[PDB]
Amino acid sequence: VADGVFYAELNEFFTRELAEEGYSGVEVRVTPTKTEVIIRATRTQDVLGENGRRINELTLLVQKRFKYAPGTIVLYAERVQDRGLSAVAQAESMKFKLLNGLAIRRAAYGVVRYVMESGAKGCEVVVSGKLRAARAKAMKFADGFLIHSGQPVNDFIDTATRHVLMRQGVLGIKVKIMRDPAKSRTG
Amino acid sequence: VADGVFYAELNEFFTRELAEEGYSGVEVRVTPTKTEVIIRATRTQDVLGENGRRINELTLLVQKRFKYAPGTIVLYAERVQDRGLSAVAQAESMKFKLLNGLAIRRAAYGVVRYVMESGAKGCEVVVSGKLRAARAKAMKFADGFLIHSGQPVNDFIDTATRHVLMRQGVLGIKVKIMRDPAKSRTG
Amino acid sequence: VADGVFYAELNEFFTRELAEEGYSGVEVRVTPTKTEVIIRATRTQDVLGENGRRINELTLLVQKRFKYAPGTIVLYAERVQDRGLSAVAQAESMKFKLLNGLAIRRAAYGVVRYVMESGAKGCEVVVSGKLRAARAKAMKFADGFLIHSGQPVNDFIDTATRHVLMRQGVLGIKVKIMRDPAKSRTG
Amino acid sequence: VADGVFYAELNEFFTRELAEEGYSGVEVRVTPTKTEVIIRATRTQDVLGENGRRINELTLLVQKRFKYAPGTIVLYAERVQDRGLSAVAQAESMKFKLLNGLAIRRAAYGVVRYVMESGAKGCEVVVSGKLRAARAKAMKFADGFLIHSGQPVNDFIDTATRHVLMRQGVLGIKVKIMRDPAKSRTG
Amino acid sequence: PLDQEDQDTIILDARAGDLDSLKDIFTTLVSPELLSTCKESESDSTALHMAAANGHIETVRYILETVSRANSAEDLKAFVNEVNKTGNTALHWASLNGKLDVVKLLCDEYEADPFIRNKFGHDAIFEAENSGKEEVETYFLKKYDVEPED
Amino acid sequence: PLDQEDQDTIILDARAGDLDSLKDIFTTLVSPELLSTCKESESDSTALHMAAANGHIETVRYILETVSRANSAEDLKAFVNEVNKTGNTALHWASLNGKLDVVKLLCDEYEADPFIRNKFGHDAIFEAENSGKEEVETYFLKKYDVEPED
Amino acid sequence: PLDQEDQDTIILDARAGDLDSLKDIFTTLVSPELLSTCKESESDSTALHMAAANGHIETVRYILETVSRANSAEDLKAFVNEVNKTGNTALHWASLNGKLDVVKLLCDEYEADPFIRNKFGHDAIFEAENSGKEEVETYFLKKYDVEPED
Amino acid sequence: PLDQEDQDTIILDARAGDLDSLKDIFTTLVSPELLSTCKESESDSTALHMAAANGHIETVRYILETVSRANSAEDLKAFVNEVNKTGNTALHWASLNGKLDVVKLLCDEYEADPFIRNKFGHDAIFEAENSGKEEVETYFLKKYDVEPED
DSSP: OOHHHHHHHHHHHHHEEEETEEEEEEEEEEEHHHHHEEEEOOOOOHHHHHHSSHHHHHHHHHHHTTTTTTTTTEEEEOOOOOOOOOOOOOHHHHHHHHHHHHHHHHHHHHHHHHHHHHHOOEEEEEEEEEESSSTTTTEEEEEEEEEEOOOOOGGEEEEEEEEOSSSOOEEEEEEEEEEOGGTTHHH | OOOHHHHHHHHHHHHHHHHTEEEEEEEEEETTEEEEEEEEOOHHHHHHOTSSHHHHHHHHHHHHTTTTOOOESSEEEOOOOOGGGOHHHHHHHHHHHHHTTOHHHOOOOHHHHHHHHHTOOEEEEEEEESSSSOOOTTTTEEEEEEEEEOOGGGEEEEEEEEEEESSEEEEEEEEEEOOOGGTOOOO | OOHHHHHHHHHHHHHHHTTTTTTTEEEEETTTTEEEEEESSSSSSHOOOOSHHHHHHHHHHHHHHTTEEEEEEEEEEOOOOOGOOOOOHHHHHHHHHHHHHHHHHHHHHHHHHHHHHTSSSEEEEEESSSSSOSTTTEEEEEEEEEEEOOOOOGGEEEEEEEEEEEEEEEEEHHHHHEEEGGGGGOO | OOHHHHHHHHHHHHHHHHHTEEEEEEEEETTTTTEEEEEEESSHHHHHOTHHHHHHHHHHHHHHHOOOOSSSEEEEEEEEEOOGGGGGHHHHHHHHHTTOOOOHHHHHHHHHHHHHTOOOOOEEEEESSSOOOOOOOTTTEEEEEESSOGGGGGGGGGEEEEEOOOOOOEEEEEEEEEEOOTSSOOO | OOOOOHHHHHHHHHHHHHHHHHHIIIISOOOGGGGOOBBBBTOOOOOHHHEEEEEEHHHHHHHHHHHHHOOOOHHHHHHHHOOOOOOHHHHHHHHHTTTTEEEEEEIIOOOOOOOOOOOOOOOOHHHHTTTTTTHHHHHHHHOOOHOOOO | OOOHHHHHHHHHHHHHHHHHHHHHIIIIISOOGGGGGGGGTTTOOOOHHHHTTTTOOOHHHHHHHHHHHHHHHHHHHHHOOOOTTTTHHHHHHHHHTTOOHHHHHIIIOOOOOOOOOOSSSOHHHHOOOTTTHHHHHHHHHHOOOOOOOO | OHHHHHHHHHHHHHTTTOOHHHHIIIIIIIIIGGGGGOOOOTTBBBHHHHHHTTHHHHHHHHHHHHHHSSOOHHHHHHHHHHOOOOOOOOHHHHHTOOOOHHHHHHIIIIIOOTTTOOTSSSOOHHHHHTTOOOHHHHHHHHSOOOOOOO | OOOOHHHOOOOHHHTTTOHHHHHHIIIIOOGGGGGGBBBBBBTOHHHHHHHHTTTTTHHHHHHHHHHHHHHHHHHHHHHOOOTTTTTOOHHHHHHTTTHHHHHHHIIISSSSOOTOOOOOOOHHHHHHTTTOOOHHHHHHHHHHHOOOOO
8 A cells, every 4th residue: 555655745746736626635546566546626527638638647747756667557536525615524523523522612613724724715613512511401502603604784684483274284484574774773 | 432534644644743763653542531642663762852842742733733622632652663574573464364365475475565665674484384286295395585685605505414422411513614606616 | 650569569460360361561651530551461352351341340350459449540451572482572682781791691591591481482592793812803603592492303404505507597506404313323 | 448237237236235334336447457346335344344354255246246257356445425315416416407407396306305215304405596577676586395394393483683782893692482382372 | 616614524424424414415415526526624635535544335335436427437536546645545544444345345346556655655555564454455465466666 | 566557657658758757757656676567458568668669769778777777687688588478579579660779779788589489480580571671680690690490 | 949048148249239230130040029038147137228228229229129019019018117136127227327318218219117116116216316317317307297205 | 975865765764664774874874963954856855754654653753863862952943844845844744644643743742833834825734634634633623722814
């Protein structure tokens, strides 16, 4: 199997060589006189290119940079979701963090930092349950952490629901009214 | 008790005489040689005014317009919520509409029209249940109707939740990531 | 005007005399040789009763308890929303609390306590903004407080949205999938 | 490259041979005197097993079933998300459906059917925008489709928000009250 | 012809619901052709207004029958939809006071416009809903194609 | 000793706020030791109740000073927290009527219990909030460690 | 009649797409009446399966034309919808491999059932979507009235 | 002094983990004072880089001990945090490859900066999380006060 130096150097090479092709990372396996390097990106159309144009160019430019003889390495491609934009991955990540004794606030911060550095427009983390001591056993808490989520105009929203019995079955009604701030502004 | 003409004429008078005091409506009761008119508005501070300044002015200006002798009527005030901005009232209203054979779409339209004419910035109505025929008994529908609710950037939001077992109790995790549209725009 | 003792004693009388009629409170005004007592409840149909049956009974039973001569008091009725079940009133209440130097946690507790004592099935309060010090100016917080809100199965929900360009206009897509816990339970 | 029959037969073999290992699908590539078969599952720990115990057993059991000589095929593993439980994949799927002239209701049905057959506990699809003709240009619609989402008790929820000006900054307040149905049930 | 004091008496009688003295007046003392011209001093409100606000269906139907019989079709339309100084039709008042029978009569048989907007910008549709008269409002939403606007 | 008719007169004077005739009564006509025993006929409400509900801070402070001076410490505690037939303390009434000065006096100097629950299950904390007396309610939430219960 | 080794050769040729040797075989060496009976050794999969999975539309159409011409209408229906040991139709395989032309041919002209469920409970509709073959899936949802079940 | 070919040999040995020939080299053939100057031809990566990326904790500790002993305190700091042409520290590589023991050694005993940002703008904190090395990432978030930025 490939060593950590190889992973590191491949990562350096590709992040620069595949800047806008949404490069994620790389997997690599070693076999009898063959070495396989799987490239993972968000879009594989730019990577494979016109009939392997970008692929074969890389494959040879990789030989020159890592001194492999022709025919000893080959480049593959796989589409993967960006990890820093994956809600699923970050929730799982938060799960790991919590299960290993990291304070909620610090875990939230980690994820939020990672997601913004990954280029999101906004991120929200919320952890809920019996986070602090309370006299009522049924009392529950939520700590939320957010960057760039929502407008000031969301604080002018009231909602009601009703439950109505009809012949065809029971219907649910929900009404949302967003009040006009420019009708309650002082003076 | 006061007749419908009186209610109507009082309503005409007050809507003009109390334009920015957030005038809602009026209740009126008649007693032995006394006639009570309760004014309902969103803010009663402008209506009562400086030591009944606005009240006593009205009370006399009402005598001149409706030809009551001095001491035969008196003006009261009550704070009420605006009906067209009340989520609770409109949901109840929708309940009435549905229970009296009005199609969902028409009921929704009525409420939405009323709420905007009442000066809201936005309104949403949603009715859910078995609204149409389906082969699976558990299949449910929702018809939504909205004016000025949400941004285009809300369609770039993915969420995941996890459920984690900790010593202190079970914690809930929620992660929201809003992707940057300016990083996926073609070209 | 009526004194605080009168308000207090009226409140004692009515809370017992109108136990299931959803009694809220009472307003009272005093005039030339007449005294008006407005009763406020959730449903006025039980209070007014069959042609003022319950009203006239009260009016006389009130004379006997407070020693008013017949014809010196009269009972009115008004429908009002229960204060402890009114989202609007409790949000306004929370606003007052915060503006008068009460810590968020203590304000939330007050409201939550009041709402449950008022007989709600569940209550949630959330306050958001720059609640604590952070290095990024755009970093925002939310502290949530809840009793009896949500199921454990809500922590198995992932959502994605897409934004699609069509001829008729731009469409929004939202997909919610609730995973089956009974398919991920260990062993 | 491997033909469609091979993909099909591999899929038949693995779905039975890897029933509880959360088998998803298979990728396969063909090279100079080597044939690579990448197995994709939800958990790769059961698949790789104790030091490739399950892998090497498969690799040989595959030789016997597809008549490959020893050393001509090798089995790999990759962790992937289940497609029918992926909110992201189904939203993208819905996007494809809509862009290819499929009616909203039919697209929604497709996704919902796929997700339940994939073993979810619940699924919701919602499409919004100018879905139908309306006189106001700002009027927008939403059609929702759901299986097993929410409780009847959600129709007893009212919410209000307030926006409060404090020294430290502007705070947002949200209050949710869930009314007790067992306090409004007739009789 | 007909002076203010007697116009007032005629509409005070519509208000009261004294249908008896109304027929009395228009068979013998005043031409029925002139009923459509009687307007209050201050408001400019017609007799239709008064009877409509007070739910006197028999008086309302009489007023309408008489005007229809005694005037041109154009004059009848201009009367039913006549507005006072505040811009209100009889329909507006009937809707505010939740008088369903009057409303069905005005809209079904005599084709009143519930879309006329007053000095404050409100039509009968709004007024009904604004006074919690859900029966009148539900009738409007069935009868007419009512949608939100700009 | 002290009959009902004169107990009534004493508390009617607390109600009115006639502090002048109160000092008058307890320097000369009745022992101050007996002030803590005067209760209304119907309700069982004390003079503290009446003065407290009506926001007469000077009368309230006098009543408290006198009772404290003339009785045991145990008797003073049992008086401040005395409940009527309906189970209400003076504090309950003061909170219902939103009398802040009285409330601070009762709780800061004389250590009244705002957690006493009446026949309907409500304490002063609830009563304040239930009558929209936000000033009194905010005071409670600062002063005491108030949380929701079971 | 026709032994396993020669059934294998026939379907290996369907797999390859050698339409030329297929017509060769069924004009001269084997009756076309017997094409519908050739099944693989292990799987029980027909020649339709092989050609369908591999997107060989001309071979597929030939196989179908020949079977239709040489057999009863009942025998043709039972052939198109024939399932292997795993319970899969040719349609299932064509959908897994996203072969649109084959699928339209099977469903439009020869009325294949895309609702047949295999040993794992899946129909062609599922299989298409499960392999990300959105073109085939969108075709199904237009062509048939497809809804979720119990 | 020390040429490129022999700098390469030294760091190829760090890569391999041949600690034995490393001590061999720096007790007898090269001054330990010069270990901190050996850099690869293409990348400018040090021997610390190679050993760190490959999780050879004993080799890593030796390299650090030797450099510390043979150089100034300033020279040691500049070495641990030395970046290659791509701007990566040894820490960056250790975090990418999820080598926890190396990371604790670098940060606890030798005070490596995990906030150094490379040519792409990423620090060790990012790199760890970006490669799914949750153990290394959780260590960072405990050890340092890590928050999101502008």
